[PDB]
Every structure is written in structure tokens, then in C-alpha cells.
Amino acid sequence: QADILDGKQKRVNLNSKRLVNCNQVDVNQLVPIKYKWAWEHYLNGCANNWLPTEIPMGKDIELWKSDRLSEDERRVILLNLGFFSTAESLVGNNIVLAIFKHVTNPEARQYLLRQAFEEAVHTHTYLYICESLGLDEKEIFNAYNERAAIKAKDDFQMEITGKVLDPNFRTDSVEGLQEFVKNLVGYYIIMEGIFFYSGFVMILSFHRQNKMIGIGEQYQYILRDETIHLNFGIDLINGIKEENPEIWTPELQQEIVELIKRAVDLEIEYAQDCLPRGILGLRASMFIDYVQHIADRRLERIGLKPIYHTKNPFPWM
Amino acid sequence: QADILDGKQKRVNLNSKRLVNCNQVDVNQLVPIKYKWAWEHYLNGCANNWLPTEIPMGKDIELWKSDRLSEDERRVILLNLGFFSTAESLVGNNIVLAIFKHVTNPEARQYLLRQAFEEAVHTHTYLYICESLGLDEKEIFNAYNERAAIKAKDDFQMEITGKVLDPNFRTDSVEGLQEFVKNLVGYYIIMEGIFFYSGFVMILSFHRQNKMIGIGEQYQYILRDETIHLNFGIDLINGIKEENPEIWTPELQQEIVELIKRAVDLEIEYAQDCLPRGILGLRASMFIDYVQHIADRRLERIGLKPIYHTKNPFPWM
Ligand SMILES: [Fe+3]
Ligand SMILES: [Fe+3]
Ligand SMILES: [Fe+3]
Ligand SMILES: [Fe+3]
Ligand SMILES: [Pb+2]
Ligand SMILES: [Pb+2]
């Protein structure tokens, strides 16, 4: 029996929980869980646990060090490792430094903790690949400062991670919450839902042709994780919209479509930089259609109309 | 070859990396790793992966629901679940909202991500135990508002999680960094290194007598994780002290010994509340010696002299 009788009044009421701005209820108590979709993403993520080094790199090392890969094939591998190597850190740091603080709900935060740790595992993966192949890790991890197409994507990303980090930033104003939703869109929809996809397609294409299968298998595990990251982000954005409808104005909607169009342009320039002529039957041309196609799929998931209407040239994805 | 030639100047120099206040080097690039101990804790944590529900609770449910446990035995289980259930959230939220931002080093942050996710797994564990035993999760998770001995520990904890959360808090002053080190001490040394131990001993004592073994096995996995959390915290505090020696004044040292003495008092009151008369051969008396003994071991690890000099009554720990 409680020896602080008044404490019983602090048990959390399910119906008082909210995704953001919830400071009327004790955020430290997990129960009763309200957003079951967040708990499900958490359990699914936990079930997907994997260790990069359980994947053998022996055949990849032999192939990489032989004369059987073309310079154009090596280029695709190097450019994608360059971009992914720090993109994980950008995403992980954003979850922690920007999102977590403002998602005032314990079960959603449970998932964020799983998500951020999975970005650490992804980072470990690129380090393992670099050291396995004998690449200079310092050069690969610094790609986003040395390769214009990668830097452009990451500089674009900063244009949204910025604001939310200010010491005085708050989500308890319509404009503060809109700014927060733009950050969620920038990281979940754009970075994780678009910027990683040309790369997934290129790397998984090697795998399908039985080349660099160790890297291919690791990217398959990463893609499995990223699918959940994206689905969680979509549910979070949709949940915040539902609980704060005054936020989802024609103006915010248009700003979001604008950010997505800009990201599509940057992702196309990145796919062209990876494929100046083409390898494995892929041509940069195909990525214009593909990047525009997934952008339409992302738009629809957060209630916006598709704008490109292009067909998917990689249905196996 | 870099297409942004100036970018090559941004590769990180190993000797410019620091644990705190490091804004002269790109914190987003993991390499080259400098604090290898952090990377080791990370790999060790990853290797310890476990899922609470892989541990069977059938025998525990049968025992719990039978008439074979005494009210005093049930009390120990209920009080510890009450305290641990939200202590994990307090720790996880602190890592994210207070520590991560100020530990300006990517490999240390890699570990923090593993640590925070493990606190989520611990939280899952208590929910699984509650639902398995048919306890009312809302009452258990609200224990820190309903039980004075638990609330006292958690209110004490807030006295340090506070400051570092202020919008204007910074570690680039000797007093700001001292305040940050007091928070690290409060969470790693005190919450994780002392406040969890009477509970570990009590629960593991059931396990040793073949009672509630499912809960006992889960606590064994939690203890294995917490040992690394503590060791990482110790290395971090010692590393920060080494790189910012002007911080470790007689005054900070005394304030730390003071906080530890206060925590020992609170932990003893908590052990007495769990054992008003004793079970399994344990008496509250033994915890006075034990809590004081581990406090001495923690003091020594961060370079302070032991002050209690008591012997350990539970060497099997
Ligand atoms: Fe990732
Ligand atoms: Fe991700
Ligand atoms: Fe824990
Ligand atoms: Fe811990
Ligand atoms: Pb452009
Ligand atoms: Pb007292």
C-alpha cells in the first residue's frame, strides 16, 4: 500500500497522452501505452537485431582486390560508402538532439532509442567494410566534405536540423510545431526515405549479380531497418497532424512539397555522380524515374498528392 | 579524387579530439577513433544483446500465484520492480537529454546510443515481468510517486539532472563542466553504481535459492549490462578529469563525496523499506555494510579515498 497516498493521483491517464507538448502527464512512465504502433515498431526493430561482422567479407575482399571490377563499379561502391558513412551520424544525432526532446511520449521514445542505436550499428557496418577492403576510412568518412554531390545533400539536410537545435526552440506554438514537423519530414521522409534509395538500388544491384555479396547482405539488413525507421516516421508525422490539425495548412503542405522536390533534384545529381556512364545494366536515366517514383510514394503516405507520376524501373525493390 | 579540393583539410586529426567542448573538429565523423575504450564498451554491449521475453516466466507465475511465497518475499519483488521500472527511464532520458549533447566525441556517442537502447530493453523487462505476474503495471510504474523510499531516491536524482537541461547550459566554463561531471557522477556512479545494487542483491538472492528464477535470470542480464554502463561512466569521468584537470578541485571532490554519502543514506533507507524484517537469510543490517562497501569501491575508481571501510557481506556479487 502506497505510503505517499497522494501519489496515486499521479498514475497516467491514457487519454491525456499526446505525441508532442505533453507536459501534463508524467512522461517517465511507460504505461499505459497509448501509441501501440510505436511499441510495435520497437519490438520489430529489436527482433531485427544483427551484427555487421557476422557477415563474411572474404569474397568481397578477393573481388575488390582483383582486376575484375571496373573503375566505374568501384566508383559506385566508394561514393555510396562515402555518403552513408556520415549520413548515419547525422540521422542519429538528430534523433537524439532534436526529436527525442520534443516527442513527449515514452513509448515513442522507446522506439527512438532503438532507432538511434540501429544508426550506430549502420555506422559500424561502414567502418567494417572500409577496414575489410583496405580503404582509407579517413578519406571515405570525409566524403561529405570532399564530394560535391554528397556535400550538397548533407548541406541541404542542415537547412532543417538547424532551428530545432536552438537553445530557445519550442514546439508549443503553431510555428514551432510546424518547424518540428519539417525536421521530421527532412530526416524520415527525405534523408531516410529518399536519399538512401539510389544507393540501396545500386548496391543491391551488385548483390543480385553475385558481386560484393558481403556488402550487399549488410545493405539488405540496413534496408530492413530503414523501412521501419521510415514507417515509424510516417506514423509520427501523421499522429502529430491528427492531434494538432491547425498545423497542417496549405502553406506547410506546400513548403513540404517544395523540400521534397529539392531533395529529388539533389538525389538525381547524386545518382548521376555515382553513374557517369552506367554499370550492371543501370543508367542514371533510370534514377530520374525511380527517385521521382519513391518521392510520390512518400508524398502519398503523409497525405499529399503525387506530383511526378513516374513508373518504378526497379520493381524488385 | 575529391571534387571539393579544400575538403581534404577537414579530415579529422586524432590529436585534436576531446571528450568535451570539442567544436574544432568534425564530431560527425567516427574516424579516426581516439577513445578506444568507448569503442570497446560499445562492441561488448552489442555482444551482450538479449531479449527479455526469451526468458521463460512460467515457473515464476506458478510460484507467484501460489501460497508458497511469504508476504515479505512478495514485498521485495514489488518494491524493486517499482523502483527499477522508472529508474531506467530516468537514466535513458538523462543520457539523451543531458549527456550526449555535451560529450563531443563520436565513438563515446556510439556507446551512449547502445547504453540508452539497453535502458529501453530493461524497461521492456519490467513491463514483461508485470504482465506475466498479473501485477497492475500502472501501480508498479507509479511506485516512485507512491513509495517514499523510492521517491526520495528519484527526487535526489533530480537535484542533478536539473541544471544540465537548462536551455542556456554550457560546459565551456570551469563551473559548467564541473556541473556536467556532477551529473555523470549522479547517474553513473550513484544511480547505476549504487542505487541498483541493493535490488540486484535482493533479487539475485531469490535466484540463488531457486525462487522466481525467470526474474532472477533477467536481472542477471541487466546486471551484466549495468556493469558496462558503470565502467564506461568511470572511464568518461576519468577521461574528462585528465583533459580538464583544473576542474578536479578539492571543492568538487568534496561535493562529490558529499553526494555519495547522501546517496548511501537513501539507499540504506530503501533497503530497510524492502526488508522490514528479512527474507532468505538477508537482514537490512547487511545492506548498511554492503552499500557502504560498494560506495568505497566507486570512490576509489574516480580517484577518491574510501570513507566507510566496511567489508562486503555478499562476496558472490
Ligand atoms: Fe541508417
Ligand atoms: Fe535510419
Ligand atoms: Fe538499466
Ligand atoms: Fe544503466
Ligand atoms: Pb543542384
Ligand atoms: Pb532520509
Residue A201 near residue A290 (C-beta atoms within 8 A): yes
- The cell for B53 is 521475453
Instruction: Give the Cα separation of A238 and A163 in Å (integer).
Output: 21
- The cell for A106 is 515514452
Instruction: Give the Cα separation of B130 and B138 in Å (integer).
Output: 10
Residue A274 near residue A201 (C-beta atoms within 8 A): no
Give the bridge partners for B3, in sequence order: none
Residue A165 near residue B58 (C-beta atoms within 8 A): no
Q: Between helices B106-133 and B213-243, what is the axis angle to 10°? A: 160
Q: Does B276 touch chain A (CB under 8 A)?
A: no
| Residue type (1 letter), A28 | N
Instruction: Give the Cα separation of A21 and A15 in Å (integer).
Output: 14
Cis peptide, bond prior to residue B167, ω within 30 of zero: no
- The cell for B65 is 500465484
Instruction: Give the Cα separation of A124 and B30 in Å (integer).
Output: 9
Residue B198 near residue B264 (C-beta atoms within 8 A): no
- For A245, residues 6+ apart whose C-beta sits below 8 A from its C-beta are none
Resolution (Å units): 2.0
Mutate to test the interface with A, among B141, B150, B161, B225 (most CBs of A within 10 A): B141
Output the CATH code of domain B1-317.
1.10.620.20
Q: Do A90 and B28 touch (CB under 8 A)?
A: yes
Q: Does B4 touch chain A (CB under 8 A)?
A: yes
Instruction: Give the Cα separation of A107 and A105 in Å (integer).
Output: 6
Cis peptide, bond prior to residue B32, ω within 30 of zero: yes
Alpha-carbon separation of residue B204 from A202, B77, B288 (angstroms): 51, 11, 18
List phi, psi (to 5°) of A104: -85, 60
Smallest CA-to-CA distance from B186 within B262, B251, B243 is with: B262
Alpha-carbon separation of residue A302 from A258, A305, B247 (angstroms): 14, 9, 50
SS (H, E, C) B241-301: HHHCHHHCCHHHHHHHHHHHHHHHHHHHHHHHHHCCCCCCCCCHHHHHHHHHHHHHHHHHH
Residue A100 near residue A171 (C-beta atoms within 8 A): no
Residue A129 near residue B19 (C-beta atoms within 8 A): no
Instruction: Give the Cα separation of A149 and A144 in Å (integer).
Output: 8
Smallest CA-to-CA distance from B118 within B267, B200, B227 is with: B227
Q: In B, which residues are within 8 Å of A167 by CB distance?
A: 167-168
Beta strands, E only, chain B: none
Alpha-carbon separation of residue A24 from A14, A18, A105, A132, A256 (angstroms): 12, 10, 11, 51, 30
- Alpha helices of chain B — where are they, by DSSP H? 36-47, 58-65, 71-94, 100-102, 106-133, 137-141, 143-146, 148-161, 174-184, 197-208, 213-243, 250-274, 284-301
Residue B46 near residue B114 (C-beta atoms within 8 A): yes
Q: Do B89 and A8 touch (CB under 8 A)?
A: no
Residue A161 near residue A98 (C-beta atoms within 8 A): yes
Alpha-carbon separation of residue A27 from B87, B118, B188, B196 (angstroms): 13, 19, 22, 22
Ligand 5 centroid distance, CA of A268 (Å) = 9
| Residue type (1 letter), B166 | D
Helix (H) or strand (E) holding B156: helix B148-161
Smallest CA-to-CA distance from A222 within A307, A300, A291, A123 is with: A123
- Ligand number nearest CA of A268 is 5
C-alpha B270, offset from chain centre: 17
Active site residue A128: yes
Ligand 2 centroid distance, CA of A236 (Å) = 14
- The cell for A10 is 499521479
* DSSP code of residue A280: T
Residue ranges per structural domain of chain B: 1-317
Cis peptide, bond prior to residue A32, ω within 30 of zero: yes
Half-sphere exposure of B112 (CA within 13 A, CB side): 29
Instruction: Give the Cα separation of A284 and B67 in Å (integer).
Output: 72
Judged by DSSP in three states, A213 sits in: helix
Q: Do A8 and B142 touch (CB under 8 A)?
A: yes
